[PDB]
Amino acid sequence: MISLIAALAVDRVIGMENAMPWNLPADLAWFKRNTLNKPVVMGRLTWESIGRPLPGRKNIVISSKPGSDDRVQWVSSVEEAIAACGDVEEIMVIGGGRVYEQFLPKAQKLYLTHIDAEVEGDTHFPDYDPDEWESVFSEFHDADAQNSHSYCFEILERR
């Protein structure tokens, strides 16, 4: 099964100047919890935004250049990227925007972190039709010491 996991600011902003315009440890924990023991897939600039694989996970990145790296599996499209996962129950897509867009029709579940902050960004999460998803899980958290802005964790499923 395919799923997308993302942190969304106000009006769906996900990134600015090859980075994320916030720092939330709670959402980091949520990310780590739901991406654990699952394979992850990302685009080039995101991989380059990290530069180091996720521990004990099968890391897959999508591109049009030769693998500049041997510690990760390189793929050039969507359907063979799924075949690059094998016989798995759940596949994780962690970004970014164009990957989100291409896999959103493929995705059957959405792990969304709703960040309550309006901030600046060049990249957005694909507009999904709220007609197409329903919320099975909603967990709201106000901002605190470690968390600069409030946030709400949500799990969506297709219909």
Ligand X SMILES: NC(=O)c1ccc[n+]([C@@H]2O[C@H](COP(=O)([O-])OP(=O)(O)OC[C@H]3O[C@@H](n4cnc5c(N)ncnc54)[C@H](OP(=O)(O)O)[C@@H]3O)[C@@H](O)[C@H]2O)c1
Ligand Y SMILES: CCc1nc(N)nc(N)c1C#C[C@H](C)c1cc(OC)cc(-c2ccncc2)c1
Where does this chain bind ligand X (CB under 6 A)?
A: 6-7, 14-15, 18-20, 42-46, 49, 62-64, 76-78, 94-99, 123
Residue 99 interacting entry, from ligand X, ligand Y, none, C-beta within 5 to 8 Å by type = ligand X
Nearest Cα residue to 34 out of 78, 75, 1: 1
- What's the closest the beta carbon of residue 89 comes to ligand Y, in angstroms? 19
Partnered with residue 133 across adjacent β-strands are 158
Would you say 58 or 131 has its CB closer to ligand Y? 58
Would you say 82 or 99 has its CB closer to ligand Y? 99
Looking at residue 153, the DSSP 8-state letter turns out to be E
Residue 44 interacting entry, from ligand Y, ligand X, none, C-beta within 5 to 8 Å by type = ligand X
Q: b/e string for 119-138 if b means 16 or more Cβ within 10 A? A: eebebbbbebeeeebeeeee
Would you say 98 or 158 has its CB closer to ligand X? 98
Measured in whole angstroms, how far is the alpha carbon of residue 60 from the centre of its chain? Answer: 13
Cα end-to-end span (Å), the chain: 15
- What's the closest the beta carbon of residue 86 comes to ligand Y, in angstroms? 19
- What's the closest the beta carbon of residue 27 comes to ligand X, in angstroms? 9
Binding site for ligand Y (CB under 6 A): 5-7, 27-28, 30-31, 42, 46-47, 50, 54, 94-95, 113
Contact 57, 39 (CB under 8 A): yes
